[PDB]
Each structure stands twice: as structure tokens, then as C-alpha cells.
Amino acid sequence: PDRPLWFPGSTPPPWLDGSLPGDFGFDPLGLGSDPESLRWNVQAELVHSRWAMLGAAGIFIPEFLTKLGILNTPSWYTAGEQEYFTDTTTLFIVELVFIGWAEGRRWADILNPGCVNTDPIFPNNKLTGTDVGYPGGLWFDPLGWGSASPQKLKELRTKEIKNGRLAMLAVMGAWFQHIYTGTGPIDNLFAHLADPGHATIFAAFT
């Protein structure tokens, strides 16, 4: 009810109480006005956040080590168009069945909170996640950091979601930058650090 907003001096929408991690009253199109839509959008923002964090780390960490003498991995933008031990389509099929399983059980979880907490083979192992989007258990929370006081959960999930936003924007940034400049993101970072006055986006468009 009392929280900093994205647009100081504005009234947050009725459906955004502030009980949700990352609530800053931003939904000017009302895309989360309906409870079910808001909920589904929460899950979607979660998975988007985590995939984009994994991705941002996955393109910025290696590219930064590649610029040094530590690694020699090729550009993230062209890492897909190359060949591997098997064709990329086989890898894609395996990815589809595995990730298909995981996303399947997660989908069943979103549509029915309880039904997918137990291991079909060994009924001994279960997940200790209370609310959806946070599976827990030994596999997804071995350090037990997933279960704590509502304050700590609020804080941690807010950190998670924020690093998620930053990551999404970062990955999109990487894509568009490699489209425009034609070089790695680190090269862009160093170019901008070298001359922030001219070496920007207008160094190619104007």
C-alpha cells in the first residue's frame, strides 16, 4: 500500500496492492488488471527473468573472458550457426523433449498448484515449494534459502525479479547492438568508455 512508484505523483492501479515482489505500480495498459492474467504474467515474468539472467551471464561473462587471454570462445551472435558433434536439429529435438518435460510439469503446476510435487518414480522425494513459481525441494533449493520469513522472501524475490528486468533489457541490448555495430558487446563497452562523446548509437546512424 505504501511503496515507491515508477511514476512519482501517480496513483497505482487497484490490482497492484504491493504484496507482489517487484510491485512499483507500473501497468499503464492494464495488462494485469484481471487476476488470472496478472498471475500468469507473474509466472511469465519469472521465467523470462531467469532465462534472461542465464542468457545475459551466458553472453557477457564469456565475451569478457574472451577479450582477455582466459578464453577463446566465438561470438555469442554466431555461436549457433556453427557445427557441433551432431547436427543442431538433433540437439534441438533433445532440447524439445527434455525442456518439454520440465515445462510440462511446470505448466501442470501453474494450472494446478499441488499436482506435480511428487516424483513419479520414487515417491520418497518431494518438492517443498509453497507458492507457484518457486519449486524448492532438494533439486531446486539445496541450500534451503527458498524457505524463510515473508520479509526475506519479499526482499530476495524482489532482487530476483529486478536482476531479471535488467537481464532482459541487457540481452535485448546485446542483440540490437550486434545487429547495429557488428562487433561484440565488450567491444562496444570499451569503445564507449574510450569516447562517450561520439562513440554512441549516432556513430553509425548519423
Partner: protein, 196 residues
């Protein structure tokens, strides 16, 4: 049984049938009589699929290990027999006409067909539709629920396996066991991806 945990099983699948895993997303068995006919059809297609698949894979395996030289299933009909395929077809058609009409009458009316029309002395004990028993069960095994759902399980597996055999032969042009061997050879370079 839950084919899709956790999707609610349809109301007409109350688990009072062997093999009930609540799988009927298109609602084909919404009608009771439809469910009966489809149970029978699943049993029959399943059993014929088990027999057929066994007769397709097993002779090929024994040929591979050099036990007996047996021609593959898709090249077995070509002009090798004494009575020719046409006569064989007439015979087959007749005997199957009789047998299948008989079973059909059993499905339409359970207690109506059980005794030998020639030697009326011999008869089949009143059992379940689709599970005749009597002379069909000389070893007197118990038709338990477990055995039934095992039958249906192996039946479904064998049906899918038959579809697999058909498509695989259609694509590769070799036997199913041959395809299996080539898959064992180099798994990551010998799949449906490379064959198409």
C-alpha cells in the same frame, strides 16, 4: 492412473476398467456403449498387434544371430508358398468370417454364444465379454485385474510399436531390428533426423 498429472479424469472413466488412466481428451467414450465397443476394439487391436509385432521383430532377431534364415516381414509374401496367396486369402476370409461373427454375437449378447453348435455337450463357462476363458485358457491362469491391465499395457505398447515398424520401414527401407542396430552403432548420427 494419471496420464497427465494433474489433469482431471473424465467422469465416465471411474477407474472401474482395467487400464483406466483417464486418457480420453477427445471424449470418444462419453457414451457407455461406445466405451464398451472401444474396450473390445482396444483388446482386439491390441492382441493382434502383440502377435503381429512379435512375428515381425522376433524372426529377424534370430536371423541376425544366424539361428535360422528367415526373410523379413515386408518381403515374406512374395511367391514362396505351396497354396498361393489367393487361396490362402479365401481360407483366411472364411475362417475369420465365422470366428469374428461369432465373437461379434458375443459382444451384442454376452450369454448368447458359448456352446459348440456341433457338439453341444461342450461349453464355455459364463465369463466376461472380451475375456472368453474356458477352452481358450487351458492353463487355467487367473484373470486378475493386474493380469488384465498388463495385457492392455503390452497391447498398447505393441500397437505403437507396429505403427513404429510401419513408418520406420516406410522411411529407411530396412527391418526394425536393423534400424535398432544402426541406432546402436551411432546414436547421435542415426535418428529420424538423418533418415529423412
Amino acid at each position: 492412473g494419471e496420464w497427465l498429472p494433474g489433469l482431471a479424469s473424465p467422469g465416465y472413466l471411474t477407474g472401474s476398467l482395467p487400464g483406466d488412466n483417464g486418457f480420453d481428451p477427445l471424449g470418444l467414450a462419453e457414451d457407455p456403449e461406445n466405451l464398451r465397443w472401444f474396450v473390445q476394439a482396444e483388446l482386439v487391436n491390441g492382441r493382434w498387434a502383440m502377435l503381429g509385432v512379435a512375428g515381425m521383430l522376433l524372426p529377424e532377431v534370430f536371423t541376425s544371430i544366424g539361428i535360422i534364415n528367415v526373410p523379413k516381414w515386408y518381403a515374406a509374401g512374395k511367391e514362396e508358398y505351396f497354396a498361393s496367396s489367393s487361396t490362402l486369402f479365401v481360407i483366411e476370409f472364411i475362417l475369420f468370417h465365422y470366428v469374428e461373427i461369432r465373437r461379434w454375437q458375443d459382444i451384442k449378447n454376452p450369454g448368447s454364444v458359448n456352446q459348440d453348435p456341433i457338439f453341444k455337450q461342450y461349453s464355455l463357462p459364463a465369463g466376461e465379454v472380451g475375456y472368453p476363458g474356458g477352452i481358450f485358457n487351458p492353463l487355467n491362469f487367473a484373470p486378475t485385474l493386474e493380469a488384465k491391465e498388463k495385457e492392455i499395457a503390452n497391447g498398447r505398447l505393441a500397437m505403437l510399436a507396429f505403427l513404429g515398424f510401419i513408418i520406420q520401414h516406410n522411411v529407411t527401407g530396412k527391418g526394425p531390428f536393423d534400424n535398432l542396430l544402426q541406432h546402436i552403432s551411432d546414436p547421435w548420427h542415426n535418428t529420424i533426423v538423418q533418415t529423412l
